[PDB]
A paper describes a structure:
With the exception of α-hemolysin, which is homo-heptameric, leukotoxins are bipartite toxins, formed by the non-covalent association of two distinct proteins, a class S and a class F component of approximately 31 and 34 kDa, respectively, into a likely octameric species. Panton-Valentine leukocidin (PVL) is associated with necrotizing skin infections, such as boils, and plays an important role in the poor prognosis of necrotizing pneumonia. Two additional structural domains are also found: the rim domain anchors the protein to the membrane surface, while the stem domain, closely apposed to the core β-sandwich in the soluble form, contributes two β-strands to the pore β-barrel. Since the binding of LukS-PV to the membrane is a saturable process, the necessary presence of a LukS-PV receptor on the cell surface was thus proposed. This was recently confirmed by Spaan et al. who showed that the C5a receptor is required for the binding of LukS-PV to human neutrophils.
Five mutants (Y181A, K182A, H245A, Y246A and N248A) were partially affected. LukS-PV mutants Y181A, K182A, Y246A and N248A also had a significantly decreased calcium entry slope, from 65% to 75% of the control (p<0.05, one-way ANOVA). In the case of the rim domain, wild-type LukS-PV and mutants T244A, Y246A and N248A displayed only small differences, with r.m.s. deviations comprised between 0.20 Å and 0.30 Å, whereas the structure of the rim domain of the Y184A and Y250A mutants were markedly different, with r.m.s. deviations of 1.10 Å and 1.28 Å, respectively, when compared to the wild-type LukS-PV structure. In close proximity to residues Y184, T244 and Y250, residues R242, H245 and Y246 also induced altered biological activities when mutated to alanine, albeit to a somewhat lesser extent. Residues R73, H245, Y246 and N248 are specific to the two proteins, whereas Y184 of LukS-PV is replaced by a histidine residue in HlgC.
Numbering used by the authors: 3 to 120, 126 to 243, 246 to 284
Write the structure that this text describes.
């Protein structure tokens, strides 16, 4: 679909969808080519959406009756890179450390290659919107060829008051005598959506390409998680309770990576490969 955005400019919209049962990921990518006569560069707006399954599991610790485990996502990973020397990452959203429950931001474009991370005054716009209850979003790394976000366990309200994402007693349950590993941890109504279900990413990246320097560019988009393990141990003025201990970053970069090829002249998208 083509959208006129004013005098001598239009936007060509394309979409690519890929899922992985191996990683528990759906990448829904929107590629919006900005074709403007008044802008000396080819420009692409990437809206990265979809789903990253939390893959939260509860299992018994070995051959014990009293140590049970919760493997859960400490952090979600969102990354974008290019290997094209003619392509520059010019902007991305969210840009700064944000801890609000809902992250809702707008990228605005104006004829002449003017991008603003602030609608109606613009010729074109794209909006990101995602929930990250109890998590914080931040840029882990960035350069002219890449941007990487971390959406990590941050602040939680528990039965023992406020807890950090690093507290070993985080998510520890109320049933020390149950044989069900799920019972050793707080119920789903006490867990944030990012733990019980997964993450619905909504991220933006704008890339610029030098006019007539090459018809194609490759982009690698990575969606994943880093898993923590919480062990809940039964402890025994004769009552029993549960105590947590943590293996932080027990499983890092459990990521689904997809390589996309973009054609700047034809506006066609191809999935080159994936893991």
């Amino acid at each position: 679909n083509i959208e006129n955005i004013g005098d001598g400019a239009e936007v060509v919209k394309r979409t690519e969808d890929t899922s992985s049962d191996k990683w528990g990921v759906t990448q829904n990518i929107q590629f919006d080519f900005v074709k403007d006569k008044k802008y000396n560069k080819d420009a692409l707006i990437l809206k990265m959406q979809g789903f990253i399954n939390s893959k939260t599991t509860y299992y018994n610790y070995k051959n014990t009756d009293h140590i049970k485990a919760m493997r859960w996502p400490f952090q979600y990973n969102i990354g974008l890179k290019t290997n094209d020397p003619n392509v520059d990452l010019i902007n991305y959203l969210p840009k700064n450390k944000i801890d609000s429950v809902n992250v809702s931001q707008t990228l605005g474009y104006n004829i002449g290659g003017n991008f603003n991370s602030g609608n109606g005054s613009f010729n074109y716009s794209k909006t990101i919107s995602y929930n990250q209850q109890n998590y914080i979003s931040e840029v882990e790394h960035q350069n002219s060829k890449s941007v990487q976000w971390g959406i990590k366990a941050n602040s939680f309200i528990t039965s023992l008051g406020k807890m950090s994402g690093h507290d070993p007693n985080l998510f520890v349950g109320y049933k020390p005598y149950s044989q069900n590993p799920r019972d050793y941890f707080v119920p789903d109504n006490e867990l944030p959506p990012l733990v019980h279900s997964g993450f619905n990413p909504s991220f933006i990246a704008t890339v610029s390409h030098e006019k007539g320097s090459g018809d194609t560019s490759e982009f690698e988009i990575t969606y994943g998680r880093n898993m923590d393990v919480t062990h809940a141990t039964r402890r025994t003025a004769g009552n029993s309770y549960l105590e947590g201990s943590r293996i932080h970053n027990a499983f890092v970069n459990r990521n689904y990576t997809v390589k996309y090829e973009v054609n700047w002249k034809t506006h066609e998208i191809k999935v080159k490969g994936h893991n």
